[PDB]
Amino acid sequence: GITVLTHSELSAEIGVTDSIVVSSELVMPYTVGTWLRGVAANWSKYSWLSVRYTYIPSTAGSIHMGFQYDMADTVPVSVNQLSNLRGYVSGQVKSGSAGLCFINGTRSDTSTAISTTLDVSKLGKKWYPYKTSADYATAVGVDVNIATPLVPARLVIALLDGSSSTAVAAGRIYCTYTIQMIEPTAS
């Protein structure tokens, strides 16, 4: 049967350096958070009803985020390339407070927040399999466009402008989501 879950969770630790760092992460239940990782493994398939990442400061540097929908694409390498992507967002790596709004799930003057939402209304299909990191790498190894039907999207993140060549703790990214899960099964 259809089960609905809405919840927020720590999704990544952020560090800044002087040299830009593009890295990305798949938007599936396995990867967003270690709680939902565990919870959703008890259903075979899922469907995002709403997902958002949002940075929280805790200094010199810039943070950059946006989504790709075809696992077939090449992951940007410059702030520029990234600048094109859907759901593009950016701000100062020491700015962010106004965000907690969305994570604490309350209220409100957002303009100043570093946060972006999956399109959902523009995803591939409705029901994706619960898949794991390993699974994705694996699949990719055969045909890339095998993967886009395994994973709804990927968040790509850029981090430059640091004043240190050594990584400096800047803040973090929280996923807040509303997922539906069908088809029970043994963890």
Side-chain angles (χ1 to χ4, degrees), residues 1-18 20-103 105-106 109-118 120-139 141-187:
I2 309 226
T3 313
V4 188
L5 192 184
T6 297
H7 185 52
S8 300
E9 207 161 348
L10 173 80
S11 293
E13 301 279 40
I14 305 292
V16 278
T17 85
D18 49 27
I20 192 194
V21 163
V22 201
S23 59
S24 78
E25 190 69 88
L26 313 152
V27 193
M28 56 197 201
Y30 187 86
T31 52
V32 307
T34 74
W35 187 80
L36 179 74
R37 170 184 308 155
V39 164
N42 314 287
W43 281 264
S44 285
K45 297 179 197 161
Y46 65 88
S47 155
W48 290 123
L49 287 146
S50 161
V51 195
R52 99 174 286 132
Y53 293 90
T54 139
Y55 170 84
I56 294 280
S58 46
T59 273
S62 185
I63 219 284
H64 292 239
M65 306 177 313
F67 293 106
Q68 275 172 324
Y69 294 42
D70 192 344
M71 290 330 100
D73 315 319
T74 21
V75 179
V77 244
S78 67
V79 167
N80 169 214
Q81 292 191 357
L82 207 190
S83 191
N84 303 158
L85 279 188
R86 337 44 140 19
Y88 177 63
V89 295
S90 213
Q92 193 82 197
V93 111
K94 77 227 177 32
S95 164
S97 290
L100 257 136
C101 182
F102 303 102
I103 298 155
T106 344
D109 34 318
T110 294
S111 50
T112 112
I114 329 292
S115 180
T116 179
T117 307
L118 182 79
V120 154
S121 59
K122 8 237 222 287
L123 282 175
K125 29 164 174 168
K126 176 144 203 71
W127 313 93
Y128 297 81
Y130 184 95
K131 306 276 76 210
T132 71
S133 291
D135 284 12
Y136 176 93
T138 266
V142 173
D143 189 278
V144 199
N145 286 119
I146 275 189
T148 114
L150 283 227
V151 14
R154 76 166 91 84
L155 182 81
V156 356
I157 292 130
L159 269 144
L160 60 175
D161 291 343
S163 59
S164 169
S165 96
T166 233
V168 182
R172 39 183 131 203
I173 301 179
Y174 287 83
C175 182
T176 287
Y177 48 67
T178 292
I179 186 177
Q180 35 203 330
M181 314 175 276
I182 71 185
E183 296 187 358
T185 160
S187 57

